[PDB]
Amino acid sequence: FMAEMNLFNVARGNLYLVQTATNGNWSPMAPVAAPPFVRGGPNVRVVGRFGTIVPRPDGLEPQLIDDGNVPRDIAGDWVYPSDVLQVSVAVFCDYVWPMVKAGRTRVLVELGHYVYTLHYYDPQISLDEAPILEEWLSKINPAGIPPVP
Amino acid sequence: ANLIGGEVSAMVECMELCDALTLHIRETYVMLLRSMHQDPTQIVQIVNECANNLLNSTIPISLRPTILCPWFASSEDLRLQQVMHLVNISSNTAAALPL
Amino acid sequence: DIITRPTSDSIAAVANATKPAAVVSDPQSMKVTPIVNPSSYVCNVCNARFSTMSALSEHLRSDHRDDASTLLATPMINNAIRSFLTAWDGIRILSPDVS
Amino acid sequence: PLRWPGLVDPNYRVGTNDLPNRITLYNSLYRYNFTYPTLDGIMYVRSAT
Amino acid sequence: LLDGLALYGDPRIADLSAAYLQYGGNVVREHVPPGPSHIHRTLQQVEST
Amino acid sequence: AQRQFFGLTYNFYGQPAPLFDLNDLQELAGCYARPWTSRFSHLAISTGSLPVWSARYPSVASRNIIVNTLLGAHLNPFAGGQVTSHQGITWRDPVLSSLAPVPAIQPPPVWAVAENVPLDSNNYPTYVLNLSSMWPINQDVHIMTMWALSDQGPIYHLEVPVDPMPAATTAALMAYIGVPIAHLAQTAYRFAGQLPQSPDSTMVSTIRWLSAIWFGSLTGRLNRSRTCNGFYFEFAKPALNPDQAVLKWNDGARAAPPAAAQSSYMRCISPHWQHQIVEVAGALMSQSVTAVTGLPALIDEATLPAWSQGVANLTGNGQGVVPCLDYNPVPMAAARHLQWRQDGLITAAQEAQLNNDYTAYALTIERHLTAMLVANPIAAGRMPIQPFNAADFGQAGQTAAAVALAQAMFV
């Protein structure tokens, strides 16, 4: 099973979230280029164990608390352990996710294995993947998560 | 005008019909209140510590010049308060059970 | 007002002849959703959700007014804690008594 | 005049008074405009792992 | 608030203290001298004037 | 009220131009693109106790440093008597409300780049006419000057008169029981900021005493066993909340007034101040008083860097020249702990522990700053943090003299 888990709709490895506007081919389940900002890479920050956020006054934009218990600037690269997401999806959906859609930040979701699901589309007509993800986020809670689309 | 909160000053210094004795009382009462003042920013740490770090919290607050949060009490006050509890109970020790 | 002598017909006819549409129905659209969700509005200091900008504007115009509002004495003084919001499920808890 | 030094004395310091001996009727003082905040907060729970 | 001092025992208090006695004859006593009062000061001033 | 001031711009550290960029000019915490009355806008609303800093503002002092450098390029009217422009940006109006791109109607002359230019308000007559609205410029310019004169840490002034604290001040002081030093500094900045004030004022004298009291507590000379006038500053354990020192009033013993009037200039001699809030707060608070009252006397040039030698209205070596002392926080903490055990607040075992804790805490400050410096080399174009050398963390300076002054000051 550990060698053929894909046949049971189970995938391994982490999940990335980067705004990509492609015109040609796309293959999320079999990437060709090396993934960016592997954990421990330069300027890569891992969220704190509470996933809390702090506001700032008069123009200064909020900051996120890393594992070092230090507020950090949201823009850049970030790593989310799944559990932190499960307890802080709301603040993520309210502050981090918009920055992702702006392409000003990249997020790596750490989760060893997970159930995935697919959705096919016609490559000819226009499409935007954001609503599907936004729905998927809306159904995460401290208890469990829906399969990755 | 000093420390103008946009339109209005935070405190003023004026001279008017006023007897010293009453003024002396009023000033001390202010001193008493300010002695009870607590810095609000420390609340979040108080919460986090009291929660044994099981909770992490944020409480934003604006910092104006004149701001009063009479919530602090020294250990002496509490210790005295505890002793007072024993005294008021002394006639009927059974009254402590509801605790 | 100011006079608005209409222009010559021929010029108007020529101008009206050349008027391409502004928006067309093209399947290919490279559509892009809004960056910020327009369906809900949150109070940036207490994170209360709202359905419209007007409702949110009033809430901060009431609940988050740091005015030195009254030169007359305030009728009431509130307790330290008014409310808390649990992030993990978006439930707001009200102090059993803030007044 | 003894009860009105703060009004008719050219050598009157601000806020001074001989309280233990007699009572003056006209004096200088501070009037305050304190503010009484209320707190609304957000609390986050620690992750499982 | 303060009734026990009047209702029971001698009201002529000096400085409150609580203690417990161990069988070994050792006595552990904890005094509770009050912190700096403010009303008391101005009251004494009022009496003086 | 005071109607004239003097000042001096920053010094380029070998670089050819003032060390800031347009984005800095675009991201000030106050009103859009105005440097005045903005040195606290980044923390007007606060939560928690964590210091506030960011990638391009990585130290608590960083924002003020940038503001100081920014002002250095646009204060020509107080030197050349005329408004100028730099890189196509100038003031909106002669009142200097804020900065804006130059209009294409009557472009002002381009500013000639220079450093350490002396300043005199009398070079710009319109300031006197519009004093009621240009008042905050006085405070900020003075603050910039007080930092520019030092290569290592802001300079500020202390004094204590022979008379006891006047009653009027005591009435004002009690409003500030139980408030931390940082908040007080913010209040002090606002006071001298908005409207012109007479040098003689209950509020002015009040803040002056506050500055003296805090220093007395800083050395540990003032504590709950020996108050100034019932007042003193409380301290938390350095291992946690090392900066939440607050003001307290107490009914205990009072220190007797000094034999003669005491006054001196003070400075931090180690880079620690750049990321330690209390140094900034204390310096700004004292500087605020000097801003409204002017400088009591010229400063001694002897211990100052080269560019500060002999500034016209600032430094001198004559007779009426107040000396300037400097100190290092770590030995200062050691002295403060020693006072506490001598006064009997603590046992020697605790005193040993406190020194270990503080030294460990200070080490992190050094480690943070030194790593941050290489991340922001001064040759990049902007100076978020002031350059230093590793040996600067070990200098003891005149710390021994400093505590001696406090002992002579409160007695």
Side-chain angles (χ1 to χ4, degrees), chain F residues 19 33 41 71 89 138 178 205 261 271 318-320 326 355 358 387:
Chain F
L19 303 171
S41 178
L71 287 165
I89 294 188
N138 170 40
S205 51
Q319 298 296 339
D326 55 359
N355 289 273
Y358 196 91

Side-chain angles (χ1 to χ4, degrees), chain D:
Chain D
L2 269 301
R3 297 189 177 278
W4 309 83
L7 185 59
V8 293
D9 182 7
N11 313 341
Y12 160 81
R13 315 301 288 277
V14 179
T16 183
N17 63 83
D18 44 50
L19 194 54
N21 292 27
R22 76 183 70 263
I23 298 183
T24 71
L25 303 178
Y26 191 84
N27 300 272
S28 60
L29 83 172
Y30 270 88
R31 285 187 172 276
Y32 306 96
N33 233 340
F34 294 110
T35 319
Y36 316 90
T38 56
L39 305 185
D40 292 309
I42 307 174
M43 42 187 53
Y44 306 78
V45 67
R46 183 149 46 79
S47 72
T49 51

Side-chain angles (χ1 to χ4, degrees), chain B residues 58-69:
Chain B
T58 62
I59 303 172
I61 178 169
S62 164
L63 301 183
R64 312 304 287 274
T66 51
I67 171 178
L68 186 47
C69 301

Side-chain angles (χ1 to χ4, degrees), chain B residues 8 10 22 25 29 34 44 57 59 64 66 70 90 92:
Chain B
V8 52
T22 309
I25 293 174
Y29 183 65
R34 293 306 309 186
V44 301
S57 57
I59 303 172
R64 312 304 287 274
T66 51
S90 56
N92 172 21

